[PDB]
Amino acid sequence: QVQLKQSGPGLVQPSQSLSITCTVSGFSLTNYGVHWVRQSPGKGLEWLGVIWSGGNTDYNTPFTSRLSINKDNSKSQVFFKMNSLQSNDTAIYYCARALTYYDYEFAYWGQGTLVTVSAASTKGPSVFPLAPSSKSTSGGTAALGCLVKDYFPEPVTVSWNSGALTSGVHTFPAVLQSSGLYSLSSVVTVPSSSLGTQTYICNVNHKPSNTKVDKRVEPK
Amino acid sequence: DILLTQSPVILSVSPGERVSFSCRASQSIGTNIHWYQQRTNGSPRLLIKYASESISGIPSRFSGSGSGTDFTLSINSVESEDIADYYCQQNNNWPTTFGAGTKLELKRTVAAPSVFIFPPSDEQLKSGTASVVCLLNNFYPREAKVQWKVDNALQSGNSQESVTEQDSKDSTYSLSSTLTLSKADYEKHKVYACEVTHQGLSSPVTKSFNRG
């Protein structure tokens, strides 16, 4: 199985630099080049550069002066580094691999690293229960959730019961509050008759602040 | 750089219809175009290579055609799992460039929202802030009105809305409205009401609680 696994998301101060590691498996770096693509609100999908099997690099013209790509063949690691970042460099960064060693049709992508460029500070969220009750029950179905409040930057991962509960889950897009901190809720509907037997836990992981919270949500 | 122009920007279709995405190039690129799918919270998925060549693991309903400057990605029978954005890529000229993308939305029957309301947790109240959350679950189409009332005072400007992307399984949307008060203001009042309007409801739905 071909895979590409990138390091986690995080905040980078303006003018400072960006560093992402792409670890590959299911193929050797000595046989394929590894490309870097990013996706911004400004310019959508932009191709940034590539490090080839033998170490050579190409960089898209607007980035040649602030972009460097290196690798460790033995460790199956590719390193992306970009200098002098500004705010419109806030993007999802991807590593990718083409179908053949020389081509550009990207059949394999990393999961993407969301880099935020901003002068602010990293803040972990508080997690509050959205408790099931009569006011959230309808025809045997109860809704419940977690309020993931006041963190920065995006993103946060939310799961339920350590991945075993996925059906009927809705994790809403984060909104930016006037405080400059994000907030979101994640809800799920369950049979109301399971509330006395099953435990419901939202697993919250805000990787940029290394904050991991498991919030047990109970009928009040 | 080649400029790739995808048209239109949004496509809305019903399940089982055929659908076509267009990618126009600012100069001839032969057949050097690849197509990609991006689902909600996903990475791009490669669909077609070199205008029309198929990819292992991609459903047969996807196909592409075209040459020169004018290209087409086709889905012969849209499913709700096809809800995504679609991008084209040219690589006849360095550097490889991407189109700006086309969004594929799905139609379906009107579905009224289920409405639930959540008071603030005693946990949050300790911190000095009160969030009241109103949830509108699994409805179509996306348009809805949420109106907050506190002891019959209409609230304005102290709530925020979030809407999920379209559900890839049943084509509905869900919406949260969160009303945020200070603990003091919240304790100064009794009746918290979320009133909901939507095409699928014949009269507005109010869900509400008394603090306590």
Partner: peptide
């Protein structure tokens, strides 16, 4: 425009 929270066009 592309949205970083959802990775979708908005």
């Amino acid at each position: 425009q592309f949205d970083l929270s959802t990775r979708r066009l908005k």
